[PDB]
Structures are given as C-alpha cells and as structure tokens.
C-alpha cells in the first residue's frame, strides 16, 4: 500500500540534550552522541531527512582515553603540500583543544555526505561544565547505560 511514514523537515521537533564526557571513553561517547545526532533514538527516523537532536558536550577536557591512547593515538592531517604531514597526539589534543578531539571523533562516525555534515553542525563541545546554550533549555542525558 506504500504507507510507510516519511518524516519531513521542520515538522519534527529537535530537542537539546547535554552529555557529560567526564571519565567516559572517547569512542563510546562519540557513538552515543552520533546516534542521537542522527536521530536513531526516535521512531520517526527517516534516512533522507534530518530528525536528530542537538547535543552539548561538557567537560570534554576530562574525556577518558584507555590504554596508551593519550600518547600513542596519533591524529594525522596532510596539507596536500609535499611532505606536509602533520601529527598531534590524542593526549595533547585533549589537553589543549578537546573540542577538536570530540568533533573529529564524532565526524568519523557520522555519514560523509551533506546530511551527515548538517547533522554534525548540531554538535557543540565545551571543555568544562558551563555552556552558553541555557536559552535552549537543554535537558541532561544520562549515558552510563548507553555506553
């Protein structure tokens, strides 16, 4: 009968969640956040429409890195100039720019397309326990069981 529900843009209300990264493995935090951002947690999920929720990640500076990742997990990036390979350790990124660390982790998990990037734009990472989005009245999201 071709009656499967297909969500539309704008008709779905996107809510705001706050996720605390304190002592949570980077990958597991990224996985739960990516699921929420894509909207896999709601029955109205539609692959070709953005239906996920906004996420504010706090205390990113305290994200957990098991094993020796703090010094051994290396993030590479190439300027595209010859010999232009630059590398930074996960520990250094966590200490200096944790926002970038979390954003890279979540990007690696989101789809690599226009919809994926638009969903990525809904992610806000803040080292520390304070964020400027009180106006959005975000609700805390417990993730101890989800991880």
């Amino acid at each position: 009968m071709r009656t499967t529900y297909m969500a539309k843009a704008g008709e779905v209300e996107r809510k705001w969640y706050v996720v605390d990264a304190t002592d949570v493995p980077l990958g597991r935090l990224s996985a739960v956040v990516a699921s929420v951002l894509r909207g896999k947690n709601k029955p109205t999920f539609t692959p070709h429409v953005d239906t996920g929720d906004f996420v504010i990640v706090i205390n990113a500076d305290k994200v957990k890195l098991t094993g020796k990742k703090a010094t051994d997990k290396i993030y590479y990036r190439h300027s595209m100039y010859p010999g232009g390979l630059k590398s930074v350790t996960a520990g250094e990124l966590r200490d200096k720019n944790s926002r970038r660390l979390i954003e890279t982790s979540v990007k690696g998990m989101l789809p690599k397309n226009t919809l994926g990037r638009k969903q990525f734009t809904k992610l806000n990472v803040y080292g520390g326990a304070e964020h400027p989005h009180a106006a959005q009245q975000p609700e805390v999201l417990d993730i101890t069981n989800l991880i």
């Binding site: 896999k40 709601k42 999920f45 692959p47």
Partner: peptide, 16 residues
C-alpha cells in the same frame, strides 16, 4: 531498504 527502515524504527521504539 524498507525492511531495514522498519527494523530501525522498531528498534528506536523498543528502546523507548
């Protein structure tokens, strides 16, 4: 594809 979509939505509802 449609079985996949139904599975995903049912999973979300079951989690809820």
């Amino acid at each position: 594809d449609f079985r996949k979509l139904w599975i995903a939505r049912i999973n979300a509802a079951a989690r809820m």
